[PDB]
Amino acid sequence: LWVTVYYGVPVWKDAETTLFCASDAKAATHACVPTDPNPQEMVLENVTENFNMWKNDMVEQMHTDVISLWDQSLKPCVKLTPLCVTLECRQVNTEEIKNCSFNATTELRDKKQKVYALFYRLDIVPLEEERKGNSSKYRLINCNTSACTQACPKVTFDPIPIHYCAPAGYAILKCNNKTFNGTGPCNNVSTVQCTHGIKPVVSTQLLLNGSLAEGEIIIRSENLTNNVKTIIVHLNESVEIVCTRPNNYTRKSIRIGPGQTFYATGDIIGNIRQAYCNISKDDWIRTLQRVGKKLAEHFPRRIINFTSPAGGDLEITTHSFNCRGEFFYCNTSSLFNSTYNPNDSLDITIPCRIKQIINMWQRVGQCMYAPPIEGNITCKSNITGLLLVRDSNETEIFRPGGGDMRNNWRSELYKYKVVEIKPLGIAPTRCKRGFLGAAGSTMGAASITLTVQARQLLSGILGVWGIKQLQTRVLAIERYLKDQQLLGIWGCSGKLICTTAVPWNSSWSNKSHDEIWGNMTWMQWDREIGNYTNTIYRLLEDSQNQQEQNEKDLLAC
Amino acid sequence: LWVTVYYGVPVWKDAETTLFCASDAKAATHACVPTDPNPQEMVLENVTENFNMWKNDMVEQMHTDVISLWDQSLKPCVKLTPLCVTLECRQVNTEEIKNCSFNATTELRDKKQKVYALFYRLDIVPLEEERKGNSSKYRLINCNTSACTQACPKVTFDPIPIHYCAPAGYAILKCNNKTFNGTGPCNNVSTVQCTHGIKPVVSTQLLLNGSLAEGEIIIRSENLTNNVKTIIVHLNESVEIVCTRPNNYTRKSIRIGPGQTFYATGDIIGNIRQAYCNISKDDWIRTLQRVGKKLAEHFPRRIINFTSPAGGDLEITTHSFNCRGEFFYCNTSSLFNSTYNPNDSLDITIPCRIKQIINMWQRVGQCMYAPPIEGNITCKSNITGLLLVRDSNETEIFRPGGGDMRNNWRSELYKYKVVEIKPLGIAPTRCKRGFLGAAGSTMGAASITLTVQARQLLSGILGVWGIKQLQTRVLAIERYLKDQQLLGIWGCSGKLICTTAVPWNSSWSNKSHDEIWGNMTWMQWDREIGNYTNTIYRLLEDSQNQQEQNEKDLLAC
Numbered sequence A, B: 001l002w003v004t005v006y007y008g009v010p011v012w013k014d015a016e017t018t019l020f021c022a023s024d025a026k027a028a029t030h031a032c033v034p035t036d037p038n039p040q041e042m043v044l045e046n047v048t049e050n051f052n053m054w055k056n057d058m059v060e061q062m063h064t065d066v067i068s069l070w071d072q073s074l075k076p077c078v079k080l081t082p083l084c085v086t087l088e089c090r091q092v093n094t095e096e097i098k099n100c101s102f103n104a105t106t107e108l109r110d111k112k113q114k115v116y117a118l119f120y121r122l123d124i125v126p127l128e129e130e131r132k133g134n135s136s137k138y139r140l141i142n143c144n145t146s147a148c149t150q151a152c153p154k155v156t157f158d159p160i161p162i163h164y165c166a167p168a169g170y171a172i173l174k175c176n177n178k179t180f181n182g183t184g185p186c187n188n189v190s191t192v193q194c195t196h197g198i199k200p201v202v203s204t205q206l207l208l209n210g211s212l213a214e215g216e217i218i219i220r221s222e223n224l225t226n227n228v229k230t231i232i233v234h235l236n237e238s239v240e241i242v243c244t245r246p247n248n249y250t251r252k253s254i255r256i257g258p259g260q261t262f263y264a265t266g267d268i269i270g271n272i273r274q275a276y277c278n279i280s281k282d283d284w285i286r287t288l289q290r291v292g293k294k295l296a297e298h299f300p301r302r303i304i305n306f307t308s309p310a311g312g313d314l315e316i317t318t319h320s321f322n323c324r325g326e327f328f329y330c331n332t333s334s335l336f337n338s339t340y341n342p343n344d345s346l347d348i349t350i351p352c353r354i355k356q357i358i359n360m361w362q363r364v365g366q367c368m369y370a371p372p373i374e375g376n377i378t379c380k381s382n383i384t385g386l387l388l389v390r391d392s393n394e395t396e397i398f399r400p401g402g403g404d405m406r407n408n409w410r411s412e413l414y415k416y417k418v419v420e421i422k423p424l425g426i427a428p429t430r431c432k433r434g435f436l437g438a439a440g441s442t443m444g445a446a447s448i449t450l451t452v453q454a455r456q457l458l459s460g461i462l463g464v465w466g467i468k469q470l471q472t473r474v475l476a477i478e479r480y481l482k483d484q485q486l487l488g489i490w491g492c493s494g495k496l497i498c499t500t501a502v503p504w505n506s507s508w509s510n511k512s513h514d515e516i517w518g519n520m521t522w523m524q525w526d527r528e529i530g531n532y533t534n535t536i537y538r539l540l541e542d543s544q545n546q547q548e549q550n551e552k553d554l555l556a557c
């Protein structure tokens, strides 16, 4: 037999690459392309692939892009250096809100003004002074760390969905195997150009506004026997939650410099009220009993205890939640107060704390200040999942947890993998001299299909964001040219099928013509002879396509 | 008949693209290429094209580039934050100049010094104090808005001409139709690689140092019956204007911080004099009577009144003018003080105001401070055009106007349009299987010419400015490769003329062989069969160049 060169071979390799950031065509948006994701999903019949949501670079890539766009939005905003002064505070007489006085900087640098603003106790750090009941002195939290930046008017906290799209030459494989646990084989896969839109919703403990499971509740973890891993629970039903801050604050504007202002909380309209969340009781209870049972399947002969918060540090103990730019730290200890034993009105009130100083993304010194928001601050959302951490007592104790934002994205991106298409390949023949739809079928069947299908590959012919696009285009060109070049030197113009003068080595494969062509798919073949790739290429370029020209044409002198 | 593929077809599409910024080869200059514009203008005989100066992206592109380079020049300069202090001012006893005292910051931050500087009243804002005749207190204008930046020594105010040059694959079409009014057809066009140099001269009301009209005075507007549009008047003769500031100021240098100084006005040498402009009276009068008549042609049976300034706000009421970095706001109400009635020494003195705080480009907060300039501040220039705004009384009342800098560039760029060359095309033949100079002629004539001319297309084979160049090169490569690729798959190597096996459809065109080849130009043809482009390409790539290989070569097994 003889080596035949094929172009358009439906095989791929796992590969990492920068994906395009696509936005909403109807539209932190200037960086992304507002196009149609065109989710022309194709199912690959009879194809099984290995997915691993814990090693998915799309998650890491998203983490970086979410942070980067978020940071750009604060770039032109005011650094509140003038507020890192002694604050004289008194109790508001209109127990978490204090009335503080400052000597602020005026438009003129040689003048100061005495101004006041209201603050939440959580954002204020006492100096070496005690509560006297009338007055005491304070520092703003983080004045010993960073010049915290005020969010600008029109900074958007709208979790506008992001779509990731493959560069030409790459494809995104989606796992449709309902109940797939995030690792191992998926026996139902399909390919897309783009992912569904993912809303970069930021939270801890309770995952909000995501995609619900198609089947039953699925519990996923990198390692279920590792008590240091986060367990992601995907609900198949949403639970209604609505949060509100019913205390009518007024926004004041204080000049703190030559062309800049600070937005201060003040003039509380009459009543003092605690912020809270409204959670349906029957749905919460049903949800945990159902989660309990699924956990029991993973942890049999154990009592399940969804009974404890983290321990007391607000940053990790409460539910980090955003509402229209407002920041809530809600106490969920009343939700996670139950057990499960497999063989044994009507709402829930969650009190919430409000804080204006935000250590976003767990970074230190990258501080944002949230200005007060006037009006009806109420947000209604869907709990779609849980982040649980498993803790001797023949009991599996669980606590809600989080803070690693990657888990909020693994929870959506677990369905996707990125691979690189590798159109060249070889196989023996007896003759001497929608792209991946032909996958899961034998090489023979594909070779017929590819006489047409191979041409679908021809469809592939802001600061750092400008660079990401340039690298993407340059790489696409580079790979294209390398393949064109190899085909050129091998004498394979008319590349879909190219017979050559290189003989087949039984040492590469000793399978018969029909054993190979009718009992293997192209990927199986690629693996079986994969380490002879360089050998074959040398035989084709250094010998046969040189000898076949020199011994025929130079003789024509 | 049969479809024949042609390469080098002289057709084009209107297209937007980033143009190269070219500079003066003899030379805000580091960003542009100091090359030879090589204005090898070619006239296209018998070609009519549609131009629209009001929709010209070159104007918008220039606006951005002028601003961007101007801003880079101030990037390393000192922000005068130390001067936003209370100013104690007294009348200068050497009525617009005040003597002001400051407590300036010394090299050491713990010391202040009492210093003084002179200021123009226009740059000073009173505090809550009255004139007493001896002293009062002030703020510098814009200390409530922005930390105005001092122009550095060696910031250049030299309106160095810019040339725009087309990327390979693009051409710039120039309209040579004298009296063309900016819209509609131009019956005399030519192509260039580069535009003439355009000096980015900034002014309002009177356009200075531009290109004079070849013929008579031309009046252009997006809409002459719209009283909200600016009317651009292009003179065919220049009017001499010279402006001067004869008051001998001395430059003082005040340290205002650790490594930075402020340049202060002071020590007036003896005399106080008002700045002014010198305008020839006979030329001004002749110019307006001539403009009046041309306006009467557009607005017949009306009295024309060139009689009024904007109304009193210095920023829009006066003539914004620059002289060696100095900023003048001259009162032109004495120029625009006349009428016209179609059937009915020796100079003009224009008093001028001088201002050091500049809100360049109508932006707010992007403030520049102009340091005092010592010596003979006199500039002689050419008025080359007017920006007029038309205001019931059977009179057309005109006022000088401006502030939208784009109009200062539309006035030069009205002659140019950018188009993209599209070298591939098809036409029927009877056979089955300087680039645009051949334009305006029939396809037949061009097809002979193109056997040579098509090869001229082969000649096409700093921060953001680095990106503009990279995008330009990458795109040129991308387009090149796409065309090479299509020709490859269609079997059209030797691309200038390529017969194919695809039959001609009478449904695309039912014109005869000679009706098509001898009575149409290539652009006319491209329009007539333009929507069949994808149809033809599919027939060529999916069918004929696949079938023609498989049915001939695979049989050779």
Ligand SMILES: *[C@@H]1O[C@H](CO)[C@@H](O[C@@H]2O[C@H](CO)[C@@H](O[C@@H]3O[C@H](CO[C@H]4O[C@H](CO)[C@@H](O)[C@H](O)[C@@H]4O)[C@@H](O)[C@H](O[C@H]4O[C@H](CO)[C@@H](O)[C@H](O)[C@@H]4O)[C@@H]3O)[C@H](O)[C@H]2NC(C)=O)[C@H](O)[C@H]1NC(C)=O
Pocket: A157, A158, A159, A201, A208, A209, A322, A323, A324, A378, A379, A380, A381, A382
């Ligand atoms: C899970 O998903 C839900 C649903 O999207 C989120 O809840 C929504 O959150 C958005 C904010 O991100 C809320 O939008 C705000 O609504 C205010 C009320 O709108 C009134 O007027 C509209 C007019 O058509 C009516 O339809 C509506 O019923 C009300 O009558 C607006 O005033 C807000 O405007 C602000 O932003 C715009 C943006 O351009 C500015 O121009 C405005 O000046 C102003 O700043 C804003 O539109 C939305 O109402 C919420 N819906 C619900 C049901 O709560 C959840 O928050 C999300 N979960 C999480 C955790 O985010």
Ligand SMILES: *[C@@H]1O[C@H](CO)[C@@H](O[C@@H]2O[C@H](CO)[C@@H](O[C@@H]3O[C@H](CO[C@H]4O[C@H](CO)[C@@H](O)[C@H](O)[C@@H]4O)[C@@H](O)[C@H](O[C@H]4O[C@H](CO)[C@@H](O)[C@H](O)[C@@H]4O)[C@@H]3O)[C@H](O)[C@H]2NC(C)=O)[C@H](O)[C@H]1NC(C)=O
Pocket: B157, B158, B159, B201, B208, B209, B322, B323, B324, B378, B379, B380, B381, B382
């Ligand atoms: C319309 O077009 C006219 C013509 O170009 C412009 O008027 C000219 O504007 C430029 C400034 O942009 C003026 O240039 C300045 O001239 C000063 C006088 O030069 C003397 O020495 C030269 C030596 O050969 C003699 O030729 C000349 O007659 C004088 O004897 C210079 O001192 C200035 O130098 C400054 O810039 C250089 C740049 O490197 C620095 O090195 C110097 O230290 C210094 O900073 C400068 O050269 C020019 O004189 C003007 N000509 C006239 C006739 O006015 C108009 O301004 C323009 N219209 C508008 C609106 O801009």
Ligand SMILES: *[C@@H]1O[C@H](CO)[C@@H](O[C@@H]2O[C@H](CO)[C@@H](O[C@@H]3O[C@H](CO)[C@@H](O)[C@H](O)[C@@H]3O)[C@H](O)[C@H]2NC(C)=O)[C@H](O)[C@H]1NC(C)=O
Pocket: A214, A215, A216, A217, A236, A237, A290, A293
């Ligand atoms: C989400 O996942 C949960 C968990 O699998 C699904 O719960 C299942 O709900 C059905 C009823 O709709 C339960 O069937 C009935 O349960 C009662 C309980 O006493 C029993 O008496 C009946 O004979 C019958 O079994 C089913 O058991 C229950 N599964 C579990 C494990 O509890 C839920 O339906 C899913 N929701 C969606 C939208 O798919």
Ligand SMILES: *[C@@H]1O[C@H](CO)[C@@H](O[C@@H]2O[C@H](CO)[C@@H](O[C@@H]3O[C@H](CO)[C@@H](O)[C@H](O)[C@@H]3O)[C@H](O)[C@H]2NC(C)=O)[C@H](O)[C@H]1NC(C)=O
Pocket: B214, B215, B216, B217, B236, B237, B290, B293
């Ligand atoms: C710039 O455009 C103006 C406007 O078209 C041109 O003005 C024209 O100038 C010529 C003289 O050079 C005028 O011709 C003579 O005018 C006198 C006026 O009383 C008349 O008596 C003569 O019989 C003769 O017509 C011509 O009329 C005038 N046009 C208009 C509309 O007034 C000017 O010449 C142009 N300049 C250049 C450099 O081309």
Ligand SMILES: *[C@@H]1O[C@H](CO)[C@@H](O[C@@H]2O[C@H](CO)[C@@H](O)[C@H](O)[C@H]2NC(C)=O)[C@H](O)[C@H]1NC(C)=O
Pocket: A092, A093, A094, A099, A100, A116, A118, A266, A267, A268
């Ligand atoms: C926060 O404190 C300020 C002052 O520390 C309170 O404002 C004053 O209220 C008194 C009441 O008669 C007025 O007479 C003063 O003119 C107010 N202004 C100032 C600057 O003293 C303010 O009401 C307190 N805020 C709340 C919400 O209680």
Ligand SMILES: *[C@@H]1O[C@H](CO)[C@@H](O[C@@H]2O[C@H](CO)[C@@H](O)[C@H](O)[C@H]2NC(C)=O)[C@H](O)[C@H]1NC(C)=O
Pocket: A181, A182, A183, A184, A185, A220, A221, A222, A223, A224
């Ligand atoms: C996800 O499901 C896979 C498949 O059942 C689990 O992996 C198997 O774990 C058993 C445990 O002894 C092994 O014997 C199998 O060989 C494993 N198969 C594969 C393909 O890995 C995997 O552990 C599950 N993951 C989670 C988080 O539950």
Ligand SMILES: *[C@@H]1O[C@H](CO)[C@@H](O[C@@H]2O[C@H](CO)[C@@H](O)[C@H](O)[C@H]2NC(C)=O)[C@H](O)[C@H]1NC(C)=O
Pocket: A041, A042, A043, A176, A177, A178, A188, A189, A190
């Ligand atoms: C394998 O995955 C494919 C894709 O999700 C499933 O196909 C869907 O089946 C539902 C059933 O009614 C259809 O409504 C969808 O339109 C189908 N999607 C597509 C893209 O065709 C398929 O059923 C899955 N097979 C199994 C066994 O789960």
Ligand SMILES: *[C@@H]1O[C@H](CO)[C@@H](O[C@@H]2O[C@H](CO)[C@@H](O)[C@H](O)[C@H]2NC(C)=O)[C@H](O)[C@H]1NC(C)=O
Pocket: A223, A224, A225, A226
């Ligand atoms: C989950 O991880 C834990 C450790 O992080 C694995 O259990 C331990 O693995 C080490 C590896 O050498 C052994 O020495 C320990 O004895 C193991 N612990 C126990 C209790 O046996 C655990 O096997 C991992 N689980 C899965 C499903 O991979």
Ligand SMILES: *[C@@H]1O[C@H](CO)[C@@H](O[C@@H]2O[C@H](CO)[C@@H](O)[C@H](O)[C@H]2NC(C)=O)[C@H](O)[C@H]1NC(C)=O
Pocket: A276, A277, A278, A279, A347, A348, A349, A350
């Ligand atoms: C959810 O919100 C509703 C109102 O929006 C709260 O309803 C109030 O509950 C108190 C409790 O005694 C009643 O006295 C009020 O009359 C109720 N309001 C109305 C309009 O009837 C409800 O309590 C909230 N739930 C939670 C969990 O806090």
Ligand SMILES: *[C@@H]1O[C@H](CO)[C@@H](O[C@@H]2O[C@H](CO)[C@@H](O)[C@H](O)[C@H]2NC(C)=O)[C@H](O)[C@H]1NC(C)=O
Pocket: B092, B093, B094, B099, B100, B116, B118, B266, B267, B268
């Ligand atoms: C601007 O004011 C300064 C002072 O306010 C004047 O300078 C002073 O002139 C008197 C005249 O005898 C001197 O004795 C002082 O030594 C000068 N310097 C200072 C710092 O007081 C200055 O002349 C005024 N400028 C103009 C142009 O009149």
Ligand SMILES: *[C@@H]1O[C@H](CO)[C@@H](O[C@@H]2O[C@H](CO)[C@@H](O)[C@H](O)[C@H]2NC(C)=O)[C@H](O)[C@H]1NC(C)=O
Pocket: B086, B087, B088, B101, B102, B103, B114
């Ligand atoms: C620069 O600082 C000096 C500080 O001594 C200012 O002068 C004092 O201003 C206060 C204002 O009430 C007066 O009571 C003092 O009598 C002044 N002292 C002297 C010696 O004059 C001075 O005015 C500041 N400069 C400016 C321009 O404000």
Ligand SMILES: *[C@@H]1O[C@H](CO)[C@@H](O[C@@H]2O[C@H](CO)[C@@H](O)[C@H](O)[C@H]2NC(C)=O)[C@H](O)[C@H]1NC(C)=O
Pocket: B181, B182, B183, B184, B185, B220, B221, B222, B223, B224
């Ligand atoms: C520029 O000249 C063109 C050509 O004469 C003017 O456009 C014509 O306006 C008349 C007005 O009724 C129309 O009937 C013609 O059909 C128009 N022709 C074209 C080609 O547009 C155009 O209005 C003039 N523009 C200005 C600013 O005067």
Ligand SMILES: *[C@@H]1O[C@H](CO)[C@@H](O[C@@H]2O[C@H](CO)[C@@H](O)[C@H](O)[C@H]2NC(C)=O)[C@H](O)[C@H]1NC(C)=O
Pocket: B041, B042, B043, B176, B177, B178, B188, B189, B190
């Ligand atoms: C059409 O435009 C061309 C280009 O401007 C004109 O050609 C110019 O004619 C003058 C007349 O003496 C020559 O001096 C120039 O050298 C010619 N330029 C070029 C590039 O050849 C042509 O005359 C115009 N035709 C009309 C009717 O206006």
Ligand SMILES: *[C@@H]1O[C@H](CO)[C@@H](O[C@@H]2O[C@H](CO)[C@@H](O)[C@H](O)[C@H]2NC(C)=O)[C@H](O)[C@H]1NC(C)=O
Pocket: B223, B224, B225, B226
């Ligand atoms: C210039 O623009 C004006 C409006 O900006 C045009 O005149 C008006 O066009 C609207 C369009 O529906 C009509 O409803 C008005 O009745 C028109 N006004 C008058 C007085 O008729 C005007 O036609 C435009 N001129 C040109 C030359 O395009």
Ligand SMILES: *[C@@H]1O[C@H](CO)[C@@H](O[C@@H]2O[C@H](CO)[C@@H](O)[C@H](O)[C@H]2NC(C)=O)[C@H](O)[C@H]1NC(C)=O
Pocket: B276, B277, B278, B279, B347, B348, B349, B350
């Ligand atoms: C243009 O500049 C010249 C000088 O450069 C000015 O001429 C002076 O005009 C006044 C007016 O009475 C005469 O007294 C002077 O004698 C003139 N100077 C000379 C040297 O003779 C002329 O006025 C300026 N024109 C304008 C419009 O201001």
Ligand SMILES: *[C@@H]1O[C@H](CO)[C@@H](O)[C@H](O)[C@H]1NC(C)=O
Pocket: A301, A341, A342, A343, A344
């Ligand atoms: C459930 O079965 C397990 C089996 O080991 C047993 O230990 C546990 O006590 C049982 N629970 C009940 C409620 O019977």
